[PDB]
Ligand binder design. Structure first.
Ligand code: ZN
Lengths: 129, 254, 52, 158, 129, 197, 191
RNA sequence: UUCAUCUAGACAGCCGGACGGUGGCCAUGGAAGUCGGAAUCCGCUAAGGAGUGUGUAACAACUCACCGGCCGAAUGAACUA
């Protein structure tokens, strides 16, 4: 418990791999949409004979609620998603600082877990000697 | 829900002899499932799509070929399903836009050319000829709400009973560059300016003309025009349904 | 729908306008100064946002 | 017979992906792998450096041909190790390629140039090289134009 | 429909309204009893993103024993190997360490002194003596 | 400012005293690349330089003492005219300038010169552009995965300007109702001017 | 500033005769006679040769002298307004519902009818001022013809149908429907 | 008040060109004038920025500086109270 809290603790969140069968005009929203929900473009492709793309992307599960509808709302219903979890990404922001970017979900995790308000720092769990 | 419904239709020799199908008998039995078209019910239809070989893709003329229309139509073509295309809500197009003779003809062309692009873009290379053609009789026009529609092949026969006209090639004559050329009685293939007063098409001249004239009687509630044309129109009425006004007289007559 | 030429014709009157920071009126020809006295004929203009 | 014509920015000597060809060449009924194979063959010795790839289709034959590019060809000559995307961002380029090397390419360029004199073509082609910012013969590329204007780099217009 | 890793029945559906009407059956048509709805919580993972700048110390309740440890960010490839069976807990020492030392660069000696895998004996958390 | 125009005055003087004969090039509707290809071809043969009509008109006034011949051609110097000095056979120079043409595309706004036709031709075009074809209201049909026109139609009349949509359709089929190139109105030769024709 | 003398010229073509009182301007031509009252302007008219009229203001300021050219535009528009006329072509703009236009009479006022605009059931009746003509002209779909001698009269009414048909509490950038001025020219073609 | 442009045609106005090298170096999945870091080069030049905006995901298709056709005498910009 002590040793974890001295080595720059971080939290890692699961990442979907999402691939989209979308036509040409509506793909532009995805690049706009993803950077508003931290989505990451992996690769673009088009099926031979049809004009629709097939574009693969990484979206953290965090920003993945209601995502298709706004994708449906942004694309006029023309884009169609296929959704699957791929891997985990590490949060760049500190999850120890209560006012940090990762420090709100963990505080919410404290809210849903019943734990204290303060997060255990490395000062506790460690007998200084 | 997607439940099959039973539908039974007898028919006479002239229309069963004119059937290019591997089959035998005089009876046809139609089993139809009404899947809901909501795109978020895309799984109730994908099971529903598989169970059949023909699919009735209903398309609205006002909104045109919409986004979800394309999607399920591509889904049907994924299974190699032969489609029949029916456009509803002509009454909407004939009462909201009031497109008189050519715009209605042109708008139909817009959609059918649009859908023909889709079937030519998504025809699998085992059938090839899944293309839809109003000339081939796979496209109808009518009002689902009011419960009336027509087919060119059904309409193609109605004329030789009074003109003695050929049937084989007039079914594909109703579309494209071919013009009835009234005042001359010749199915010309170009306007040619008619030496002045450029001449009309057979489609506009023959089929839509009675339709729009009846509306003028009906949609303005013109009591003086109903009885004369209906007798020319070889239809019958009932003892009491004659006494119905516009937007409801139209329903029963067609 | 509207044919593109007619759409441009109408938008020249409906969208191709400017706005004063202070008085919000839709009255440029191409103006550099507002015509209203409530804004004091101020020169602070923006082009009216074009849809999408 | 349709002579279909296209360009690329595929990097030399590194197999060009069909993923930038399948959108374009895929529609025109072509096996991507074999037509792509032609691209790699046309780009063999150009290893490391992007260059545009002329491609002439004479009835479904991918005759790709690297357009010899002033920027690209000079950078090949610098001897700097072929840049891999991963390796480093915006690697600068400083090969000491001689001015005499340039005039050979200028003779490769006058057909695609407009200068009255062959020296004027050198002004142009170095002007493209001037964009790149690489060093040439331990001197400012711009002064070569001025030096040429000063009658110093006399070009054998033949 | 299925259960999350934290013991909450996580129903899945096509779109936002589809959940409404399908659930609308539950209280009224399908099940017939009123229940509540909440967004499913995303299960995070905790890790380090540094190399344990300061050495961890802890004292036993009797203070006779002391433990000195280090924390290090095991890389994703080892994590990928662990979860995909490349590094098998059931395998024995002098064989399990060979592949990951050979194909992941680890040191011969340290990889031999693996005490256990955690949690559950096959997780991605590791102890090195 | 003044120096360059005097420099231009000097530049005209030099050509005025280096080429006995010249062409009066009509520069109506000349694009920029078309100029580049022309000056590529005339290399060695001719020189091309045009400029301000007033500067050209003013410069000769200071040159008229040495060059009083150019008086006769001035009332032919009207509008878009330039100067092409050369000492090469009459027939050859005229044809090559007026032979090399460019099938100039139709940009939206340009007046339709004459009635444009669309013919029942096989487009050989990928179907995706059918929407573009539909936009102009062209009856179309898909055979061999390309659009094919059903009927010949006079799209627009002679006169009325080509709209944006029409310009889009013409550009797609490489149809271009515009032929653009360098013209020549007059010819000055050893102090004897006559129309080019 | 106060220019001592500033004037503009007003060409009189062959078919125009101008009767000018103190401020009562009367232009007489082939198609009729136009009259306007300018008692608000304080200008000075002078006939030079029956074919040029010089209008000058003495000791006029920037505010004062600017309106003089306004008068010349006013008189010139009268001159061309009685000779070439002023014609306004009006185009119907509609996305789904075509705007239904009629000509109707109420107490003998030549009311122009707008029905079914945006599907609305109300009747727009706009009186036609004297001298302005309404024509529905073929060969351009859904366009009416607004013609009359005086530019002020035609454009005020040509505009007024535009304002009654503006969309409320809606994004006008998407609802382009309306009846919009298409051309402002002269009744005589190329003249 | 200052600084300018100006019959060797000032400004406004209607029209044309607004190239090629050139998808300038590189990046981002892709970037081609325009998410950006970078150089502000050369030829033809009547003149054109490795680009002022519309613009696509990129393309592309438009467009402006820049300069030229038509008219003719003044005009521009920044500051003062
Ligand atoms: Zn204001």
């Amino acid at each position: 418990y002590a040793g974890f809290l001295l080595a720059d603790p971080k939290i890692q969140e699961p990442v979907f791999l999402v691939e989209i069968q979308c036509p040409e005009q509506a793909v532009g929203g995805i690049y706009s949409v993803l950077n508003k929900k931290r989505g990451q473009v992996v690769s673009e492709e088009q099926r031979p004979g049809t004009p629709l793309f097939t574009v693969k992307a990484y979206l953290p599960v965090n920003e993945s609620f209601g995502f298709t509808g706004e994708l449906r709302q942004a694309t006029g219903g023309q884009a169609f998603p296929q959704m699957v979890f791929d891997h985990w990404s590490t949060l760049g922001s500190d999850p120890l600082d209560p006012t940090s970017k990762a420090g709100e979900i963990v505080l919410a995790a404290r809210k849903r877990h019943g734990m204290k308000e303060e997060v255990p720092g490395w000062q506790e769990y460690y007998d200084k000697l | 829900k997607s439940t099959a419904i039973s539908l039974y239709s007898e028919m006479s020799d002239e229309d069963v002899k004119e059937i290019k199908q591997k089959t035998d008998g005089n009876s046809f039995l139609i089993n139809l499932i009404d899947s809901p078209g909501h795109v978020d019910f895309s799984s109730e239809v994908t099971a529903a799509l598989r169970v059949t070989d023909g699919a009735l893709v209903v398309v609205d003329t006002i909104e045109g070929v919409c986004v979800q229309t394309e999607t399920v139509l591509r889904q049907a073509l994924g299974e190699r399903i032969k489609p029949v295309v029916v456009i509803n809500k002509v009454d909407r197009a004939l009462l909201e836009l009031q497109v008189s003779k050519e715009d209605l003809y042109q708008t139909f062309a817009r959609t059918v050319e649009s859908v023909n692009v889709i079937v030519s873009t998504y025809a699998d290379e085992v059938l090839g000829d899944v293309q839809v053609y109003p000339a081939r009789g796979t496209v109808a026009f009518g009002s689902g709400l009011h419960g009336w529609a027509f087919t060119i092949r059904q309409f193609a026969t109605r004329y030789a009973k009074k003109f003695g006209v050929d049937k084989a090639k007039m079914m594909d004559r109703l579309w494209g560059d071919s013009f009835f050329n009234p005042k001359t009685k010749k199915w010309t293939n170009k306007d040619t300016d008619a030496e002045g007063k450029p001449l009309e098409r057979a489609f506009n001249m023959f089929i839509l003309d009675p339709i729009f004239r009846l509306f003028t009687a009906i949609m303005n509630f013109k009591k003086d025009e109903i009885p004369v044309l209906l007798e020319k129109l070889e239809i019958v009425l009932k003892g009491d349904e004659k006494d119905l006004e516009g937007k409801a007289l139209l329903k029963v007559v067609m | 729908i509207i044919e593109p030429s007619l759409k441009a014709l109408a938008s020249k009157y409906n969208c191709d306008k400017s706005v004063c920071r202070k008085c919000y009126a839709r009255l440029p020809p191409r103006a550099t100064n507002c015509r209203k006295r409530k804004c004091g004929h101020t020169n602070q203009l923006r082009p009216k946002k074009k849809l999408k | 017979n349709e002579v279909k014509y296209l360009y690329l920015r595929a990097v030399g000597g590194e197999v060009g992906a069909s993923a930038a060809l399948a959108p374009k060449i895929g529609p025109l009924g072509l096996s991507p792998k074999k037509v792509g194979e032609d691209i790699a063959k046309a780009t063999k010795e150009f290893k490391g450096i992007k260059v545009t790839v002329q491609l002439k289709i004479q009835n479904r034959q991918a005759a790709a041909s690297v357009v010899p590019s002033a920027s690209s060809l000079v950078i090949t000559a610098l001897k700097e190790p072929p840049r891999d995307r991963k390796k480093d961002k915006n690697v600068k380029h400083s090969g000491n390629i001689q001015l005499d090397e340039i005039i050979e390419i200028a003779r490769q360029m006058r057909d695609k140039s407009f200068g009255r004199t062959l020296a004027s073509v050198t002004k142009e082609i170095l002007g493209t090289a001037q964009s790149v910012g690489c060093r040439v013969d331990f001197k400012n590329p711009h002064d070569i134009i001025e030096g040429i204007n000063a009658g110093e780099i006399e070009i054998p217009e033949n | 429909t299925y259960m999350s890793e934290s013991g909450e029945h996580i129903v899945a559906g096509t779109g936002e309204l589809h959940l409404e009407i399908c659930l609308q059956d539950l209280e009224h048509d399908h099940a017939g009893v009123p229940l509540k709805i909440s967004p499913p919580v995303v299960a995070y993972r905790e890790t380090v993103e540094s190399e344990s700048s300061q050495t961890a110390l802890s004292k036993s309740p009797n203070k006779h024993n002391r433990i000195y440890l280090k924390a290090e960010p095991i890389d994703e490839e080892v994590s990928l190997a662990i979860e995909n069976g490349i590094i098998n807990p059931r395998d024995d020492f002098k064989a399990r360490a060979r592949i990951m030392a050979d194909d992941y660069g680890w040191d011969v000696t340290d990889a031999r002194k693996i005490w256990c895998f955690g949690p559950d004996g096959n997780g991605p958390n590791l102890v090195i003596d | 400012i003044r120096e360059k125009k005097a420099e231009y005055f000097a530049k005209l003087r030099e050509y005025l005293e280096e080429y006995k004969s010249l062409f009066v090039v009509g520069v109506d509707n000349v694009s920029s690349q078309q100029m580049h290809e022309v000056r590529k071809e005339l290399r060695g043969r001719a020189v091309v330089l045009m400029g301000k009509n007033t500067m050209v008109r003013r410069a000769i006034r200071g040159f008229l003492s040495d060059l009083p011949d150019f008086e006769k051609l001035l009332p032919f110097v009207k509008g878009n005219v330039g100067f092409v000095f050369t000492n090469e056979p009459l027939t050859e120079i005229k044809n090559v300038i007026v032979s090399n043409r460019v099938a100039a595309p139709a940009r939206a706004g340009a007046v339709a010169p004459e009635d444009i036709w669309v013919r029942a031709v096989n487009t050989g075009m990928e179907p995706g552009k059918t929407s573009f074809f539909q936009a102009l209201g062209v009856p179309t049909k898909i055979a061999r995965g390309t659009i094919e026109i059903v009927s010949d139609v006079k799209v627009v009349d002679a006169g009325n300007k080509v709209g944006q949509s029409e310009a889009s359709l013409l550009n797609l089929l490489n149809i271009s109702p515009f032929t653009f190139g360098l013209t020549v109105v007059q010819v000055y030769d050893n102090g004897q001017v006559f129309p080019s024709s | 500033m106060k220019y001592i003398q500033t004037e503009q010229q007003i060409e009189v073509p062959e078919g125009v005769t101008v009767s000018i009182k103190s401020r009562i301007v009367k232009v007489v031509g082939p198609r009729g006679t136009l009259t306007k009252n300018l008692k608000h302007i304080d200008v000075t008219f002078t006939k030079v040769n029956n074919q040029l009229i010089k209008v000058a203001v003495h000791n006029g300021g920037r505010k004062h002298v600017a309106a003089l050219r306004t008068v010349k535009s006013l008189v010139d528009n009268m001159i061309t307004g009685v000779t070439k006329g002023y014609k306004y072509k009006m185009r119907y703009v509609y996305a789904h519902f075509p705007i239904n236009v009629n000509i109707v009479e109420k107490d003998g006022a030549k009311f122009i009818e707008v029905r079914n605009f945006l599907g609305d059931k109300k009747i727009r009746n706009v009186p036609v001022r004297d001298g302005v003509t309404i024509e529905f002209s073929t060969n351009v779909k859904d366009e009416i013809v607004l013609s009359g001698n005086s530019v002020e009269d035609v454009s005020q009414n040509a505009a007024d149908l535009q304002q009654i048909c503006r969309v409320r509490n809606k994004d006008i950038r998407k609802f382009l429907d309306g009846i919009y001025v298409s051309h402002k020219g002269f009744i005589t073609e190329d003249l």
